[PDB]
């Protein structure tokens, strides 16, 4: 019924549009993403630029052209795609929910094993070992229940720089077994050999599944993983995307 591969390609399209980009990657976490107003977002940019004496002067003082598209860092992309998936009539504030609805990587592993295949779920993952935030989409399925990872990465941790559209264009469409994700996010991850750690991380999170792209010395060994796992309605995910496209 809903074409889910097209959902992702439509996120990519929205990101590629000069005005769609500003709708999608805005940082208003408290209000519904579909409550975002292009005129209002651009007026705020225009006023900030006029206040500093125009674009040339703004760029001199700030070092960025605020009309350029945003290449979102990991938390900016993950939290925005999460709102796209989870909001219906009511807003979802992912900053707030990550703190109040948090479960740990081992609680996640117990949860995922009893999710209804008749329902869709999404996990907002703050991996404090990696310093990296990403999403695991676990959509309803009449076959094997699997996850799909949506992420971007500034590249300052254990992984290389990764642009949201490059990831989504293909790897974001790759199913990951629930067992691999449980293994990745469990405390027992630490007990793995360096080789196995690089294999698991690269397989799930690296654009080319390349072990030589994983720098283990950038990982904070002791830390755990904070997860907010919630049900979502794919009809909301679809319509929220439609809504943004319409705004254009």
Numbering used by the authors: 50 to 297
What did the published study say regarding this structure?
One family of T3S effectors, the Cifs, re-program the host cell cycle causing arrest at the G2/M or the G1/S transition. In this study the crystal structures of Cif from P. luminescences (CifPl) and B. pseudomallei (CifBp) are presented. The structures reveal a head-and-tail domain arrangement, with the head-domain adopting an overall fold similar to papain-like cysteine proteases. The structure of the tail-domain of CifPl and CifBp presents an extensive surface area adjacent to the active site suggestive of a binding surface for interaction with a specific substrate.
MALDI-TOF analysis of purified CifPl is consistent with cleavage after residue Lys48 of the full-length sequence (assuming no cleavage at the C-terminus; Proteomics Facility, JIC, Norwich). This removes the unstructured region from the N-terminus that was identified bioinformatically, without the addition of exogenous protease. For CifPl, the N-terminal ∼48 residues are cleaved prior to crystallisation, therefore ∼2 residues expected to be in the crystallised protein but are not observed in the electron density. In CifPl the equivalent residues are Cys123, His181 and Gln200; in CifBp they are Cys90, His145 and Gln165. The active site cysteine is located at the N-terminus of 13 residue α-helix (α5) with the side chains of His181 and Gln200 arising from the β2 and β3-strands respectively. The thiol group of the putative catalytic cysteine is positioned 3.9 Å from the Nδ1 atom of His181 (CifPl numbering). The orientation of His181 is stabilised by a hydrogen bond from the Nε2 atom of this residue to the Oε1 atom of Gln200 (2.7 Å, CifPl numbering). The side chain of Asp202 (CifPl numbering) projects into a solvated pocket in Cifs and could be involved in either modulating the electrostatic properties of the active site or substrate binding. Mass fingerprinting analysis of CifPl localises the site of modification to the cysteine-containing peptide ‘IDESVSELGGLEMYQEMVGVNPYDPTEPVCGLSAQNIFK’, which shifts from 4261.5 Da (theoretical mass of 4260.8 Da) to 4472.8 Da (theoretical mass 4471.7 Da), an experimentally measured shift of 211.3 Da.
